[PDB]
Design an enzyme around this catalytic site. Structure first.
Site, PDB file in Angstrom:
ATOM      1  CB  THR A 127      -0.865   0.048   1.223  1.00 26.60           C
ATOM      2  OG1 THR A 127      -1.643  -1.035   1.104  1.00 26.60           O
ATOM      3  CG2 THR A 127      -1.752   1.260   1.346  1.00 26.60           C
TER       4      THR A 127
ATOM      5  CG  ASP B 298      -2.113   1.494  -3.545  1.00 23.39           C
ATOM      6  OD1 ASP B 298      -2.058   1.679  -2.312  1.00 23.39           O
ATOM      7  OD2 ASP B 298      -1.925   0.379  -4.075  1.00 23.39           O
TER       8      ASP B 298
ATOM      9  NE  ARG C  22      -0.320  -3.848  -7.261  1.00 23.27           N
ATOM     10  CZ  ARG C  22       0.752  -3.795  -8.046  1.00 23.27           C
ATOM     11  NH1 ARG C  22       1.968  -4.015  -7.554  1.00 23.27           N
ATOM     12  NH2 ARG C  22       0.608  -3.517  -9.333  1.00 23.27           N
TER      13      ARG C  22
ATOM     14  CE  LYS D  70      -4.718  -0.472  -1.059  1.00 21.42           C
ATOM     15  NZ  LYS D  70      -3.243  -0.590  -1.194  1.00 21.42           N
TER      16      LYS D  70
ATOM     17  N   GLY E 130      -1.401  -1.825   6.038  1.00 22.92           N
ATOM     18  CA  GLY E 130      -1.068  -2.913   6.955  1.00 22.92           C
ATOM     19  C   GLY E 130      -1.951  -4.118   6.709  1.00 22.92           C
TER      20      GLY E 130
ATOM     21  CB  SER F 137       5.023  -1.115   0.881  1.00 19.92           C
ATOM     22  OG  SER F 137       3.936  -1.058  -0.024  1.00 19.92           O
TER      23      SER F 137
ATOM     24  CG  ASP G  32       5.714   0.046  -2.999  1.00 17.03           C
ATOM     25  OD1 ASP G  32       6.656  -0.735  -2.745  1.00 17.03           O
ATOM     26  OD2 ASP G  32       4.642   0.043  -2.357  1.00 17.03           O
TER      27      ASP G  32
ATOM     28  CB  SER H 260       1.551   0.872  -4.308  1.00 18.61           C
ATOM     29  OG  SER H 260       2.011   0.872  -2.967  1.00 18.61           O
TER      30      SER H 260
END
Ligand code: CL
Ligand code: CL
Ligand code: MG
Lengths: 4, 250, 222, 196, 241, 243, 204, 244, 231, 195, 4
Positions: free
Chosen positions: C1, C17, C19, C33, C47, C129, C166, C169
């Site tokens: 994330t 995002d 994912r 999210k 998380g 992340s 990343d 994500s």
């Protein structure tokens, strides 16, 4: 368990 | 110390009456008149805001309460008992329903939970029954509009229209004459306002009458946009002004 | 994330995002999210997916009851306090990393909460992340006195840095704008820069391709 | 972290860097490690961010309740409440806390509470990872009954050095001044303190 | 009639223990009064020190619940202090749990709910007290909310409590009838206090020295009580009027 | 009626008759007093000599709490001991958490709330004592008297028991005749006199006098009993006055 | 020692034009040993279908649990539970066991009987909802199922076409997993008829 | 202490009766009559509503007849609120049995546990008994169709036909007169309604003062169906047997 | 009358009738005497029998090497209270290596009894106790009553017709208080004191019970032929 | 413990269970009956952790016998198996779980069918034509896959079982000291005495 | 976790  | 009253304070008399429930109903009899009327596209619940002193600010005392965005309640009897029942009713809608199913409970089931709480005050040790009768108006997707009365015993019944408290006998008669299964919500508001004047002594305006509806969804009352499946609360309290608008065309 | 929060003139904006990952596998290409705690208090969560959803609903529930009990609109600091004290009690085992934002009678607010229960205050924040990719952008372009439209651009740019750079994500950008005196506007899939290209071929099979042993009608009725 | 509190002529000053760490990554470069538990009783926080916040919140709550029943608590009392929490939960806590406050009877006071939950009343106190690098400096430069401006300089120069050598310290230098005159917040940016 | 000893209903649907708890409210023979200014809320109550041996400074029925909330009690002092300690604990806990100062009206509701419980649960007696809470709420402005042994509470423009309450009440109603507004249209709390003392004097038909009164003022961000001297300063200004 | 048979029941006037009956037990007990002074407090009490066989000096009735607080009471003696035991726990826990010894006003409310608690339920009985107590803290001297209802106030001087009226009258004179303040050693003598005067109302049996005090200057803010030359000297001053 | 792959097995679900499909294999083993060839992993509560992969004892337990909960739901609510609602109930129930979970990968499929909308969802062992337009996958051959589904799937398939697609995704995924297979069942679900087909597949 | 206010709900009279049970039964005797009749091919539950007001929402209502599981229903006479407490307990108890044994609960076993709960309130705990009598109607594959009653004592018995609540004396006499073993369901439907018609304290029996249910094998082959009658369905069955 | 239903009820004159009725069982109890010098402390107790075939109920119980008591009234209540004392003496030894002060023993009993006079459901103890002991401040005698009142005395007596002995001891005070370093003389005085409470009976060999504790004597009990010396 | 098998034929369920009880390097016993009768038409064999096995079996037996007395009725094999499964499913998350595997062989008199249930210590239940626990299955399942037919007689079933025991005596590392065989059919439970 |  999945994460984000 | 601690509660050593673990025995029932409500028991059967030799004639079979449960004294404390009867006496609680007598306290409801004393109470100010409140009523509810069920239309085809809504429900209305109304009561008199009979103030204790004119120095009191009676907007701070709400007799008609939101329970869920689609369910409202009003009462007759003892105000403090009602207040804690609303607190408990709001919470049980979450703990025993919303936190499980991710949606608000349907009217009958929330009513069912309140009834349970009131029944327990009739049998549990060291307590007296609640000194109130509630009228709960609500909407849910699969049952539509509904109106329930809950009594100190824990019993509840669905009504087309009814009234409770002081001038209930007279008001119930009035409602039998006027009620039909074709009432549009505005007609039900009007009938509710007529019925309530019979039982009100003093001033009769939007500051002494408390009145709420369960009707159309109110997107403007939601607080946010962007989830098109969330459409807003069907419960709405009519303003002081909204009531007075309907009293000139009375 | 990747998730971010950016304050502006007259409110606050959060973005994320979309994912979800289970190891190297993309479990969900378009999960939300962004969570509604109350109508004008929203939460972005990174998380453990279930933890962020569950902790956000629980506190959202209690905030509603509290709002009803007090006859007041809920404040962000109440969500903040309730979330942090809950997470602290669980000593980090509830893996929720949150950016909490909203408007209330006190003003507009922006906070982050780490899973062990520490909170931070800021004008711009990022977690997940992809937080370093996003923070690189925020540290490069953020300024004092952003307009609403500048703040939205900055937020989604920060999320994009996460999406591209990343591996944790990807997919889309969700946004929520909480402005003072106005309804929160939740902009689901505000950006969709990762549309799958047209496939080369249709894999729809000739009917009867699959060998069947038995059929039967299932009784769903009473 | 780098934190310190220094008593002087008119009261006490607390000082701290603004760095929060998540490994070698700086999770927050503008942290406020100086925290109010009462009007003129504050603390500097080091160790776990979650632990020290949770502790300070509880202490603030105790002292608010103390105030309601018995009036303004002494700085010693505030330090005692921190100790009770830190000592009794020593197995589960990573909290190095300096407590500093201003009475009108007692003037400025500093109590430091290291990891085990012991209490130590001192003229000044330093703590946090960065403090190791300035024991020499601080011991050589501290005097009692400094002026406000001297004390600000002592703290500024000390934390400047702690920040210079400690990778786990940085950002701005925050200070909180505690006198009879009230409560004053100070801030000093890198371009000033770095080249001291 | 054991429906008269515990809080169960009588045949006429009444709670005698609650009603008798109301009668204990006047045991002290003090009258209190509260009004709202523009910026403030003032509460005044009579101070009667009969015995010459008492330390007069320790004789008070006004309480500082939080930084922003004050509370005056009509009723016996043991029950009054019981209620004050609880209110102080509730207000501190609220702040810690929710991160903002407990509003006057929410505290009133909370104490009212506690009282309601004593009217329903048998093992607890009601407290023989009426609690008048005052503050300048950050959302609602000057606020007066009052609790009784029935568990009833409501907000007021102004209020009074005690044996000679009705005199004071009608006195105040007559003023607001005339003034046409919700409050005392006055800038400084000093003059709102003066108004409060003045209308208490007219309604009770008695004069006050500095040691006959007890005053609490709520402003934005602090509630405080006045010394004998701040009251004397205030009595002086009413005389030169 | 029957309102008076159960603690915590309101009568129709609004009274708790069981508390009022506990007051009768207090009024039935021996006389005890407190006198607040310049920098401290003084406590005195009459000990009725039931018999030759009571060992003199050896049935001590004044009790210390923490190191700085004295307590004396009239009525049911065990009820008073129970109250002081609780006071000692309340002071210990205060000192434990807050470091400083418990302030006297703070201490007064701890007892007050505990006594008041025993008027809330029918499963406990109210305390059969009025308690006079006080000491010296960071804000000076404080004297308090606490009744079975839980009611307490601060006092210039206080008395309770059978000679309460006689003693009250005597206290009122001192307050009028010493408006700038009374010294610690003065108060000790006055206390002896007043107990001797209030012993008029209890005079079948002769009595033993017992005094204690906290004074910032005379005892360094600590509670100590008055014995030896100081006690005998104050006895003599009292003997002078009843003749 | 990894409870989610002691018994083996898989579940896949897909949406089509006014229909949904949900399928599972029939294997129940104890590591390398195949034990039962008849272990179905799909259950239904009225018109709502639930597939569960993972530890077989928990699969059985959870079926028994959700039957219990939906039976009481029906008695009190006087209507059958809908997929959106059941999905929420599954989530609540799993998260309630957050720190001692059921080692399962549930999948919900069905058609809302008011709105007519096809609905599918998947969950992790602690309750996280994965709602999807297209497909949900679960079990020891989930990687393979993801691969098969992502390439084979297209939107708006007719029930008889959807059948072929979901079957081919299941079969070919199962054949690359040692712990899945040994038979298969496919449910095709339309607004009010449900066909159940047993597939012929390799028995190794 | 609190002993002063204890009614002692669980004691014997000098005659060896349980006061509170007797007084609860007295309460139940003023409740709307409910009748159960058992046929060879099904069961009827019929019950009279406590006197209606014209404004009562009669179709979305339930006061007398409740579903326990798919094979068992009850008819209530007494305090509705008391009955719901017991009904949810019974519903849960049914599900525990199913969960444990993967078989629907035998009717008697359910009836026994509910009756055992009632019994407990008469022997310990110092609480008032539940002011409720039930008629249980259900099917299982051991005994087939069964009728039971339970009352506040927690005593239960089985019946071919039975009434509870008001005027059970008159009702029981009438059932005894016309009941016969080989009876079909449709005959039992008629007997139930004719019995209420004659024992009612109202002027005449109408659809809006009734609740009605059947439990037949009248679905498809060797399986059982509960039918809780809608108001319009009662209005029809009231005409079909010529009471209106 | 209406106010004697339980201990948690005051009468309108501020009395506790259940406590007073507890005091009454002491009055029906057989007489026992306590007295002390500066070097020793003595208990004498008249033991009562059921009839001529029965034993004579023990009235003296050892609590520690330096402490013990005599009882008058309900004997099981003395057993409960003496057992509590044994524990308290014991706890003082194991934890502080300290012999329990007789005065503290007094305070501990008072506080134990008091709890049963303020709470519903309990009942007051129905026994009076005379506690003797020798500790760091010398010989002691205490009188315990179940109202919770404990009193330190040179001498006393409790039970039926104890007023005879209590008068005798009141005159004798100046004599017995100074019987130092002579065990047998202190006992003789105790035996004479108890004799002032006898009616239609006199002290036999299986009727009399004596105990002594002091400077270099552990608390010990004398019964049977061991008391013949004193008749 | 170790070897327990079960085969369901046309009209009965046959359970075979090894007789050896071994601890360390000593076979303590060679005539152990690893079975309990739960009701007249239901039999349960068991294998697993020492002590746990018998304690569990007897506990289930006590519960089923109680039910029988209470209702004057015999619970069906399906019902008993579900009860047993639930007990094991609870157990697996206890502080100390029962480490016991069972086969439940019963004749359902309402259906007139024999039924064999295999349940492991986790509470994993499966109904089977033939079953085994432990290492036994690694030889017998394949053998039975080959030789078993659904409509076999009780005698054919016993011959099929002889094949299984023979193979196990040829290829198993341990001496399990033969098996005790029991047949469950419409007339109840009986033991074959020469195997 | 965030350290200081
Ligand atoms: Cl921090
Ligand atoms: Cl509340
Ligand atoms: Mg293979």
């Amino acid at each position: 368990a999945p994460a984000x | 110390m601690t509660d050593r009253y673990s025995f029932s304070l409500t028991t059967f008399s030799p004639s079979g009456k449960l004294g404390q429930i009867d006496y609680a109903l007598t306290a409801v009899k004393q109470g100010v008149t409140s009523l509810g009327i069920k239309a085809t596209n809504g429900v209305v619940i109304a009561t008199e805001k009979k103030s204790s002193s004119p120095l009191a600010m009676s907007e701070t005392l709400s007799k008609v309460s939101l329970l869920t965005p689609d369910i409202g309640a009003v009462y007759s009897g003892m105000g403090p008992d009602y207040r804690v029942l609303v607190d408990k009713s709001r919470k049980v809608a979450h703990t025993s329903y919303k936190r499980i199913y991710g949606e608000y409970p349907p009217t009958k089931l929330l009513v069912s939970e309140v009834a349970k709480i009131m029944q327990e005050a009739t049998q549990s040790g060291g307590v007296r029954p609640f000194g109130v009768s509630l009228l709960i108006a609500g909407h849910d997707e699969f049952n539509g509009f509904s109106l329930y009365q809950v009594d100190p015993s824990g019993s509840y019944f669905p009504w087309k229209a009814t009234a409770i408290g002081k001038g209930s006998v007279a008001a119930k008669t009035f409602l039998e004459k006027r009620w039909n299964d074709e009432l549009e919500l505005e007609d039900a508001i009007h009938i509710a306002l007529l019925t309530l004047k019979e039982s009100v002594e003093g001033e009769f305006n939007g500051d002494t009458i408390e009145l709420a509806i369960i009707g159309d969804e109110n997107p403007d009352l939601l607080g946010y946009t962007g989830i098109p499946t969330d459409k807003g609360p069907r419960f709405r309290k009519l303003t002081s002004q909204e009531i007075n608008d309907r009293l000139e065309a009375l | 994330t990747t998730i971010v929060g950016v304050k502006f003139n007259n409110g606050v904006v959060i973005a994320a995002d979309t994912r979800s990952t289970q190891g190297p596998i993309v479990a969900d290409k378009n999960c939300a999210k962004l969570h509604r705690i109350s109508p004008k208090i929203w939460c972005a969560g990174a998380g453990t997916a279930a933890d962020t959803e569950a902790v956000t609903q629980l506190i959202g529930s209690n905030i509603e009851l509290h709002s009803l009990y007090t006859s007041r609109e809920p404040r962000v600091v109440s969500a903040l306090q309730m979330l942090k004290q809950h997470l602290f009690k669980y000593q980090g085992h509830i893996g929720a990393y949150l950016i909490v934002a909203g408007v209330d009678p006190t003003g507009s607010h922006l906070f982050s909460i780490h899973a062990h229960g520490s909170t931070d205050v800021g004008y711009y924040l990022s977690l997940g992340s992809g937080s370093l990719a996003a923070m690189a952008v925020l540290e490069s372009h953020w300024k004092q006195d952003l307009t609403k439209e500048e703040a939205i651009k900055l937020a989604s740019d920060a999320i994009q840095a996460g999406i591209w750079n990343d591996l944790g994500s990807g997919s889309n950008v969700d946004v929520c704008v909480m402005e003072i005196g106005k309804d929160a506007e939740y902009l689901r899939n505000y950006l969709t820069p990762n549309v799958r290209e047209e496939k080369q071929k249709s894999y729809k099979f000739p009917r009867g391709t699959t060998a069947v042993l038995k059929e039967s009608i299932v009784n769903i009725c009473d | 972290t780098s934190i310190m509190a220094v008593t002087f002529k008119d009261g006490v000053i607390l000082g701290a860097d603004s760095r929060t760490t998540t490994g070698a990554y700086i999770a927050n470069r503008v942290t406020d490690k100086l925290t109010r538990v009462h009007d003129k009783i504050w603390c500097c926080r080091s160790g776990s961010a979650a632990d020290t916040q949770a502790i300070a919140d509880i202490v603030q709550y105790h002292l608010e309740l103390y105030t309601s029943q018995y009036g303004t608590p002494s700085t010693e009392t505030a330090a005692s409440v921190f100790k009770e929490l830190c000592y009794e939960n020593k197995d589960n806590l990573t909290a190095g806390i300096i407590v500093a406050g201003y009475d009108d009877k007692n003037k400025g006071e500093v109590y430091t509470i290291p990891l085990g939950g012991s209490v130590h009343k001192l003229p000044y106190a330093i703590a946090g990872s960065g403090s190791t690098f300035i024991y020499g400096y601080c011991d050589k430069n501290f005097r009692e009954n400094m002026s406000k401006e001297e004390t600000v300089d002592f703290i500024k120069h000390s934390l400047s050095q702690a920040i210079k050598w400690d990778g786990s310290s940085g950002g701005v230098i925050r200070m909180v001044v505690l006198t009879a005159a009230g409560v004053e917040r100070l801030i000093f940016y890198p371009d000033e303190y770095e080249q001291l | 009639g054991y429906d008269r000893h515990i809080t169960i209903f009588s045949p006429e649907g009444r709670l005698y223990q609650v009603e008798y708890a109301f009668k204990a409210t006047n045991q002290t023979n003090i009258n209190s009064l509260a009004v709202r200014g523009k910026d403030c809320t003032v509460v005044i109550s009579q101070k009667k020190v009969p015995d010459k041996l008492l330390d007069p400074t320790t004789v008070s029925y006004i309480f500082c619940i939080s930084r922003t909330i004050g509370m005056v009690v009509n009723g016996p002092i043991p029950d009054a202090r019981n209620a004050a300690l609880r209110a102080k604990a509730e207000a501190a806990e609220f702040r810690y749990k929710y991160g903002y100062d407990m509003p006057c009206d929410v505290l009133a509701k909370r104490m009212a709910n506690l009282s309601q419980i004593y009217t329903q649960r048998a093992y607890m007696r009601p407290l023989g007290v009426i609690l008048t809470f005052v503050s300048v709420d950050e959302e609602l402005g000057p606020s007066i909310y009052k609790t009784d042994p029935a568990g009833y509470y409501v907000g007021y423009k102004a209020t009074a409590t005690g044996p000679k309450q009705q005199e004071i009440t009608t006195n105040l109603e007559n003023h607001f009838k005339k003034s046409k507004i919700d409050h005392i249209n006055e800038e400084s709390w000093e003059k709102v206090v003066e108004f409060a003392i003045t209308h208490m004097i007219d309604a009770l038909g008695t004069e006050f020295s500095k040691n006959d009164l007890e005053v609490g003022v709520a402003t934005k961000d602090k509630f405080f009580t006045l010394s004998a001297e701040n009251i004397e300063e205030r009595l002086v200004a009413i005389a030169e009027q | 009626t029957g309102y008076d048979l159960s603690n915590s029941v309101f009568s129709p006037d609004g009274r708790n008759f069981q508390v009022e009956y506990a007051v009768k037990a207090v009024e039935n007990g021996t006389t005890s007093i407190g006198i607040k002074c310049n920098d401290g407090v003084v406590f005195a009490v009459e000990k009725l000599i039931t018999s030759k066989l009571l060992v003199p000096q050896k049935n001590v009735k004044i009790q210390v709490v923490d190191r700085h607080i004295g307590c004396v009471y009239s009525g049911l003696i065990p009820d008073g001991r129970h109250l002081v035991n609780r006071g000692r726990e309340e002071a210990a826990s205060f000192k434990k958490l807050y470091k400083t010894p418990i302030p006297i006003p703070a201490f007064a409310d701890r007892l007050g709330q505990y006594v008041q608690a025993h008027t809330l339920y029918n499963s406990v009985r109210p305390f059969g004592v009025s308690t006079i107590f006080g000491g010296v803290d960071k804000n000076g001297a404080h004297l308090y008297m606490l009744e079975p209802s839980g009611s307490y106030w601060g006092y210039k001087g206080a008395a309770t028991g059978k000679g309460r009226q006689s003693a009250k009258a005597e206290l009122e004179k001192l307050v009028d005749h010493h408006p700038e303040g009374l010294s610690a050693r003065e108060a000790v003598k006055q206390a002896a006199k007043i107990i001797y005067l209030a012993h008029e109302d209890n005079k079948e049996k002769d009595f033993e006098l017992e005094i204690s005090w906290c004074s910032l200057s005379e005892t360094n803010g600590l509670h100590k009993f008055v014995k030896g030359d100081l006690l005998q000297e104050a006895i003599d001053f009292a003997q002078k006055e009843i003749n | 020692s990894d409870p989610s792959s002691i018994n083996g097995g898989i579940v896949v679900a897909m949406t089509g034009k006014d229909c949904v499909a949900i399928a599972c294999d029939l294997r129940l083993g104890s590591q390398s040993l195949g034990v039962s060839n008849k272990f179905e992993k799909i259950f239904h509560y009225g018109h709502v279908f639930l597939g569960i992969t993972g530890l077989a004892t928990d699969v059985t337990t959870l079926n028994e649990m959700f039957r219990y909960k939906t039976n009481l739901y029906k008695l009190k609510e006087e209507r059958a539970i809908e997929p959106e609602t059941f999905t929420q109930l599954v989530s609540s129930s799993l998260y309630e066991r957050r720190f001692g979970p059921y080692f399962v990968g549930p999948v919900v499929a069905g058609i809302n009987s008011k709105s007519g909308k096809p609905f599918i969802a998947g969950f992790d062992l602690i309750g996280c909802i994965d709602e999807a337009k297209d497909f949900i996958v679960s079990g020891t051959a989930s990687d393979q199922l993801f691969g098969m589904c992502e390439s084979l799937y297209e939107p708006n398939l007719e029930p008889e076409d959807l059948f072929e697609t979901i079957s081919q995704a299941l079969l070919n995924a199962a054949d690359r997993d040692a712990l899945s297979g040994w038979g298969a069942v496919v449910y095709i679900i339309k607004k009010d008829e449900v066909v159940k087909r047993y597939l012929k597949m390799r028995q190794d | 202490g609190s002993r002063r206010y204890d009614s002692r709900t669980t004691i014997f009279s000098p005659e060896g009766r349980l006061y509170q049970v007797e007084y609860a039964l007295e309460s139940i005797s003023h409740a709307g009559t409910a009748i159960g009749i058992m046929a060879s091919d099904g069961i009827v539950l019929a019950a009279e509503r406590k006197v209606t007001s014209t404004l009562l929402e009669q179709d979305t209502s339930t006061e007398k007849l409740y579903k326990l599981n798919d094979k068992i229903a009850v008819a209530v006479a007494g305090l509705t609120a008391d009955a719901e407490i017991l009904i949810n307990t019974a519903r849960i108890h049914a599900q525990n049995y199913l969960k444990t044994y993967n078989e629907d609960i035998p009717v008697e076993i359910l009836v026994r546990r509910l009756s055992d709960i009632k019994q407990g309130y008469t022997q310990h705990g110092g609480l008032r008994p539940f002011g409720v009598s039930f008629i249980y109607a259900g099917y299982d594959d051991r005994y087939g169709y069964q009728l039971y009653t339970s009352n506040p004592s927690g005593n239960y018995t089985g019946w071919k036909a039975i009434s509870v609540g008001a005027n059970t004396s008159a009702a029981q006499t009438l059932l005894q007169m016309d009941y016969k073993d080989d009876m079909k369901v449709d005959d039992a439907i008629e007997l139930a309604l004719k019995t209420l018609s004659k024992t009612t304290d109202s002027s005449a029996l109408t659809y809006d003062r009734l609740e009605f249910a059947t439990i037949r094998k009248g679905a498809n082959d060797g399986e059982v169906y509960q039918k809780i009658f809608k108001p319009q369905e009662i209005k029809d069955i009231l005409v079909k047997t010529g009471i209106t | 009358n209406n106010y004697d239903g339980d201990t948690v009820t005051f009468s309108p004159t501020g009395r506790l009738f259940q406590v007073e009725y507890a005091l009454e069982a002491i009055k029906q109890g057989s007489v026992t005497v306590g007295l002390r010098s500066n070097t020793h402390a003595v208990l004498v107790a008249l033991k009562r029998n059921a009839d001529e075939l029965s034993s004579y109920q023990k009235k003296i119980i050892k609590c520690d090497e330096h402490m013990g008591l005599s009882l008058a009234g309900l004997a099981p209540d003395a057993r409960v209270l003496s057992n509590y004392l044994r524990q308290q003496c014991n706890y003082s030894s194991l934890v502080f290596n300290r012999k329990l002060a007789v005065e503290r023993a007094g305070h501990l009993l008072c506080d134990k009894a008091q709890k049963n006079t303020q709470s519903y459901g309990g009942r007051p103890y129905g026994v009076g106790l005379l506690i003797i002991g020798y500790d760091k401040s010398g010989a002691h005698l205490l009188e315990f009553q179940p109202s919770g009142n404990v009193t330190e005395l040179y001498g006393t007596a409790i039970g039926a017709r104890s007023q005879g002995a209590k008068t005798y001891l009141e005159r004798t005070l100046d004599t017995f208080i100074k019987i130092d370093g002579n065990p047998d003389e202190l006992i003789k005085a105790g035996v004479e004191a108890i004799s002032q409470s006898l009616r239609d009976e006199s002290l036999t060999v299986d009727n009399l019970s004596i105990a002594i504790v002091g400077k270099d004597t552990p608390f010990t009990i004398y019964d049977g032929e061991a008391v013949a010396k004193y008749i | 413990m170790d070897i327990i098998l079960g085969i369901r034929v046309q009209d009965s369920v046959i359970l075979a269970s090894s007789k050896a009880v071994t601890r360390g390097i000593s076979v303590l016993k060679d005539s152990d009956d690893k079975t309990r009768q739960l009701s007249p038409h239901t039999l349960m064999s068991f294998a697993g952790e020492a002590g746990d096995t018998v304690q569990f079996a007897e506990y289930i037996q006590a519960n089923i016998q109680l039910y029988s007395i209470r209702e004057d009725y015999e619970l069906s094999p399906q019902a008993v198996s579900s009860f047993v499964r639930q007990e094991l499913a609870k157990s697996i998350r206890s502080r100390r779980p029962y480490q016991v595997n069972v086969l439940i062989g019963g004749y359902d008199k309402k259906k007139n069918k024999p039924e064999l249930y295999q349940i492991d210590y986790l509470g994993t239940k499966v109904e089977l034509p033939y079953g085994a626990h432990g290492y036994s299955g690694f030889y017998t399942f394949s053998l039975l896959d080959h030789h078993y037919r659904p409509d076999m007689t009780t005698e054919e079933g016993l011959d099929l079982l002889k094949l299984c025991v023979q193979e196990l005596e040829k290829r198993m590392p341990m001496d399990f000291k033969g098996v005790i065989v029991k047949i469950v059919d419409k007339d109840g439970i009986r033991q074959v005495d020469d195997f």
